[PDB]
Structures are given as C-alpha cells and as structure tokens.
Design a protein around this ligand. Structure first.
Ligand SMILES: C[C@H]1COC(=O)c2c(c3cc(Nc4ccnc(Cl)c4C#N)ccc3n(C)c2=O)N1
Ligand SMILES: C[C@H]1COC(=O)c2c(c3cc(Nc4ccnc(Cl)c4C#N)ccc3n(C)c2=O)N1
Ligand SMILES: [Cl-]
Ligand SMILES: [Cl-]
Lengths: 125, 5, 125, 5
C-alpha cells in the first residue's frame, strides 16, 4: 500500500546481523577460493552485491556448487577487502591496495566501487 | 526512528 | 582499519536485491506455514530480523528443517505484513490490521515494531 | 555517495 511508514535504520541493522552470522560461520553455504586462500560466505549476500556472483548462482548447474574458484590473477587481499565491504558498507581503500581493489571490483562487477577507485587515482595524478 | 517515505 | 570510507546507500541496495530474489523464488530455503497459508523465504533474512527465527535456526536440529509451522493463533495477514517489512523496511500499518500486526510482532520478537504499534494505539485512545 | 563514517 502507499500508506506505509518506514524504519530508517532497518536495512543497516539487517546487514549488521548478516555480518555477525558470517563471523560466527552460521548458515554459510559457499567457500570462495582465491589463490589457495579460502573465504566462507552466504550465496544470497554475494549475489546481492556483485554482477559476477549474481550470474554464477542463477546458473542451473553452478547454483548447487559449494566451492567456487576465482581467476588466478585475482589478489586475495583485494578480495578480502571487497567481501568486508559487501557485509558492512565500509571500504578500506589505501594507497598500497587501491590498484588491486579496483581490478578485483572490475572482475566482480561492483561498479560503484570501480568508479570511486578511478576518482581517488585521478586525484593523485 | 520511523518516517513517511 | 579506522580509515574506511562508507557508501550510504549500500545497505538499502542489498535489501532491495534480497527482496528481488524472494519475488523470483531464487535460493529460498524454508517455507513458513501460518494456518495452512505458505510463505517462502531465506533463513538468513528471517534470523537477521527476528528473535524467534534467530533462536529457531541456531538450534542444531531445527536449522535443517525446510518447513516451520507457526502457532495456530497467528494471523496470516499479520505475518505477511511483517515478512514484507523484513525485506523492505516498510510497514503497512492500518486501523484494521494493527492489533494482528502487534500480536504477531510480539510472537516473532521484533521489538521496534511492537513499540511503534503501542504508540499508534495510545494516540487513538 | 561516499562519506567519512
Ligand atoms: C549492492 C548493489 C549495488 O552495487 C553494485 O556494485 C552492484 C550490485 C549488483 C547486484 C546484482 N544483483 C542483482 C541484480 C538484479 N536482480 C537481482 Cl535479484 C540481483 C540479486 N541478487 C547484479 C549486478 C550488480 N552490479 C552490476 C553492481 O554494480 N549490487
Ligand atoms: C532488524 C533487527 C532489529 O529489529 C528487531 O526488531 C530485532 C532484530 C533481532 C535480530 C536478531 N538476530 C540476531 C541477533 C544477534 N546476533 C545475530 Cl547473529 C542475529 C542474527 N541473525 C535477534 C533478535 C532481534 N530482536 C529481538 C529484535 O527486536 N532485528
Ligand atoms: Cl562443489
Ligand atoms: Cl522438513
């Protein structure tokens, strides 16, 4: 109905509890492997944040896999930073990690992140 | 909190 | 790190995509039964929004159930309104549904909703 | 959007 009321902090409170479930390894259903480093996560959160994961988990065969291996060129620290951003809205962008974070966000199809990385790089030139 | 969206 | 930047709309964008997955019945993993009416949902979203569902899906036996039956006193329309709120932050509170919505929120242990219902009732007295 | 939280 058009007469709904809205709770401002609801979406942020849901994301905080989804990250608490990840921290405690509760109902995680996939392992993402990046150059032998392993990251446990929830498929629904990955799909909600990334064009690449949305395409992977809507495929009739890949939706049932419990392990997904990323391209060997992907940096594990860059992936870790982006997985933390998916679950918290906070991005740990630093001079020493920005090139890896940008390349990983291009691969994962996370366009807001790619745009912000490009702007921070352009400001230093 | 609550608001009119 | 304490030098993170934050994307304001990220949590709301994640919740919008979780509701799109629910609409299309993608990776839903539980059916909630309320007086023979059936509602498909994601266990992680239910746990993130409700004290009752958090307790149910952290139990070592109930975590593996694919169907959960609610108490026969629970109203299906009240449950429907609260499930929509979990996935959108919007609550369709009307004079004709407020008593059922409040009783359902007390059972589900959704305290912000219980408080708002009490205030709207107190204003009409 | 981006802000300093
Ligand atoms: C946080 C949000 C915005 O930030 C992004 O970076 C961002 C995305 C993003 C998401 C999806 N996923 C869905 C899209 C549509 N329909 C459904 Cl059902 C889903 C799901 N699940 C797909 C692509 C995305 N693409 C390209 C982004 O660029 N996520
Ligand atoms: C939207 C948020 C605030 O609104 C509520 O109404 C509300 C709740 C709420 C949530 C939980 N769930 C968790 C709590 C803690 N640690 C973890 Cl890992 C989880 C999970 N998942 C438990 C209780 C809740 N109780 C009582 C509320 O009252 N949800
Ligand atoms: Cl597998
Ligand atoms: Cl079952």
């Amino acid at each position: 109905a058009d007469s709904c009321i809205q709770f401002t902090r609801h979406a942020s409170d849901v994301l905080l509890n989804l990250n608490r479930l990840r921290s405690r390894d509760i109902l995680t259903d996939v392992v993402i492997v990046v150059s032998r480093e392993q990251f446990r996560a929830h498929k629904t959160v990955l799909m909600a944040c990334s064009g690449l994961f949305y395409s992977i988990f809507t495929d009739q065969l890949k939706c049932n896999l419990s392990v997904i291996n990323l391209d060997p060129e992907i940096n594990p620290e860059g992936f870790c930073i982006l997985l933390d951003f998916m679950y918290t809205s906070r991005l740990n962008l630093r001079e020493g990690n920005i090139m890896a974070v940008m390349a990983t966000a291009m691969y994962l199809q996370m366009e807001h992140v790619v745009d912000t990385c490009r702007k921070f790089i352009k400001a230093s030139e | 909190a609550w608001v009119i969206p």
